[PDB]
Symmetry: C8
Subunit: 86 residues, 8 copies
């Protein structure tokens, strides 16, 4: 078994598509550009998810931007992106 820290393994994602979940299950998708030890993260080509309310209709949408700085202590998961029917 290798001896790589969690942060060491996260390096493997630099410049790859990454999917980020924050407090209360809010999601972002983007290219991992940077991170630090508190886990602040910067994505490029990001897609933020926007939750919406109009009466009871909690619909949901996408906000696209060049670059997003995510404050570290709201991050809960960083995952890599996500065929026969018998």
């Amino acid at each position: 078994h290798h001896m790589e820290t969690p942060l060491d393994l996260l390096k493997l994602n630099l410049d790859e598509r990454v999917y980020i979940k924050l407090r209360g299950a809010r999601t972002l998708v983007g290219t991992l550009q940077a991170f630090d030890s508190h886990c602040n993260i910067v994505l490029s080509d990001a897609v933020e998810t926007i939750y919406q309310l109009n009466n009871e209709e909690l619909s949901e949408s996408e906000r696209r931007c060049e670059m997003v700085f995510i404050r570290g202590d709201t991050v809960t998961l960083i995952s890599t992106p996500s065929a026969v029917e018998i």
Copy 2:
């Protein structure tokens, strides 16, 4: 790959339009003037979003101001821009 911290990349926005999302999805827009390591922020030419309630009608509006100091531990995202139907 380059070796810039999250905060290093955030410098790239100094004096640019920046969109800020706080705890519970409150938003501000403005020119990034200043920031520090706790992530306290200052915007100039800011537009704060104002939520309102009158009966069930949670309408919503825009409060424009010369300068805004945003206390760092309410910030969740700082993004580059994504105003008028012609």
Copy 3:
């Protein structure tokens, strides 16, 4: 670009009218007299907003006082005060 910290830029408001939002969107308005690094603030000529309940009628009012000491960690925003119709 200047090299002024967030707190440095806040100095620019000393003795100016300032609008302060606290936890859960409670507002105060007043003349900035003092602040420290934890962000305790003193206003003079302050106007606190008072939220009221009588049945469902969440009305709202103004409490005027000579001087207000605001405990730092409840502060979320400090902004400067806030014409043709085509």
Copy 4:
């Protein structure tokens, strides 16, 4: 402009009537006797506000006491005064 800390200005209230607002808008009134850097406070001649419930009737009253120690991290505001219809 003068160079007094928030806490320096709070000294100006020693031995004066002072109105205190806690977490969730509970109030006290009293003479400021003492304070420290965590903002623990002592008032003498205090009047605590007492909220009550009997069915839906959230009435409200006044508990008068010689001296009150207010634990500092529940304080949100300390204000100078703003009792009887004649």
Copy 5:
């Protein structure tokens, strides 16, 4: 004006009846026997208030004991005990 700290003034209550309010407005009454700098407190001849539920009937009662050790960070107020009608 004297130069007594909040804790210094609390000493004045040693062996006196004292009324204590905790997080969420729970009350105790008793003789102040001890306290430390975190504000742990010991009362003797204490009367705790007991809140009760039976259907909607949130009634309320008194639990009397020789001695109570109160964990410091739940304490919000310590007050001294609380006549003509024109």
Copy 6:
């Protein structure tokens, strides 16, 4: 007056019956065996109170055990005793 800390007075209960109230008014009873400065506690001959739900019927019961370790930052009160109708 004597000069004992809260924790000094709590020693007086070692090996005595002690009643403990946690966050949100959960109770335990038992012999005080041990404690430390974070207020972690150990009781022997303990009786934990068990709350139950079946439809609306929030009934309540007793779980008896040889020894119980109570994590210190859930403790709010430790009291000396105040079981059977004959």
Copy 7:
């Protein structure tokens, strides 16, 4: 009276059946294998309790596993396991 710390007394449970309650009253049962000073715990032969929802029917079940690592700051109680009718 012995001079054993809370953690010292917990040692007495190594390799014994132990019942663990976490934040919000979630329960686990198992053989105590390890613990550290932050109170991380490892059980073997564990039985986790699984709470379930299907309409209003908050039923409840058991998930059995070889070994469970419990993160320290969610632990609230560790107790030892729990006859004539007059």
Copy 8:
């Protein structure tokens, strides 16, 4: 009895299937690749559980990904395994 820390025993799972429970009972399954002392974790071959809402129908599903970084202070349990009806 042996003298292994909780974290020492957690090593035994490196490269094994591991089931993880977060705050509020969100689950992940995957191969343990890495961990650190705050308990940040990395799994490979992970299966995140995805909760969904459409009217009242809180259905539930599986998001499969190459690698997942789980921020340590959301982890509550890490367990060894307990998929198909034939």
